[PDB]
Amino acid sequence: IRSENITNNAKNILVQFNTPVQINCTRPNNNTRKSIRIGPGQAFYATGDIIGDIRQAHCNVSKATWNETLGKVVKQLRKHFGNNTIIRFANSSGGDLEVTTHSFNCGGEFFYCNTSGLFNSTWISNTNDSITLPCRIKQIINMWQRIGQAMYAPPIQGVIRCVSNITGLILTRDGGSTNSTTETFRPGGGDMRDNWRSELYKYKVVKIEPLGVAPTRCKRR
C-alpha cells in the first residue's frame, strides 16, 4: 500500500496486487426476458423494458480468488494499524456516479458497475462460485478531464466483451474519532493522476551534469 499520509483521511491509499484477479464481462446479444404486461401503462412499460434491456450487462469476478486477494490485503493493512483492531470494508458513501459506481469503457461504450456487492466484508482478528456485478450503460457522463457533462452515441447492437485483470485498488479510510475501532474503508478514486501514480511509482527523471571540478596536486604549462 502507498499513501501520502497514513492516519489522514483525505489522502487515497493505493494498493498493488501481487496476483491478478480475473474479471470478465459481457453485454447480452438480445433481450432474454421479454415480459408480457396487460395492466395499465403497458406502452410505457414496454418502452422502459426495451430501453433498459438495450443497456444492461454483467461482470463476473471469481469469488475465491478475490476473497483470498483481499485476505492478503487485510493482513497487509493491519500492519500500519493495531492488530487487535477490527477493520472492515463498506460500499461507496455517495456522490457522482463515477465515484459511487465503477466506471470503465469497452469499445467506446461506458459501463457503470455496482461494486456494493463486492466490498461487503467484516473481519475479526485472531480468528467455484463466481460473483456477478450488475453494470448499466449510461449515456450522460461527467467528464473527468474538465467540469461538465457529455452525451455520446447509443450503444452498438452487437455483443461486446472484456476480459481483464485487476491490478490495483483505490481506498479512502473513514477517519473517525469513535474509540479508534471499526475502521471502515470505502472505495474512491476519480482523480486520474492517482491512477497514473499507481504505475509510475518508481520512476524519476534527472538531467546529467558531466562537467566536474576537483582540486588536485597537478600543475599546468
Binding site: 467528464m143 474538465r146 461538465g148 457529455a150 455520446y152 497514473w196 509510475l200 524519476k204
Partner: protein, 48 residues
C-alpha cells in the same frame, strides 16, 4: 533493444507523489481523449 545500467552503491530519494512526470501523462491522456472520442453533446460551465 533497451539499455539498462545497474548502479552499485547509491541511495536516492524517489518521492512519487510530487512527481512532475504525471502532470504530463495526464495532459497527454486528455489530448488523446479529446482527439479520439468526440461526444455528440458536450456541455461545460463557463463563468465570468
Amino acid at each position: 533493444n533497451p539499455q539498462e545500467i545497474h548502479l552499485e552503491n547509491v541511495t536516492e530519494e524517489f518521492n512519487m507523489w510530487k512527481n512532475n512526470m504525471v502532470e504530463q501523462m495526464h495532459t497527454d491522456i486528455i489530448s488523446l481523449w479529446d482527439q479520439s472520442l468526440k461526444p455528440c453533446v458536450k456541455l461545460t460551465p463557463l463563468c465570468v
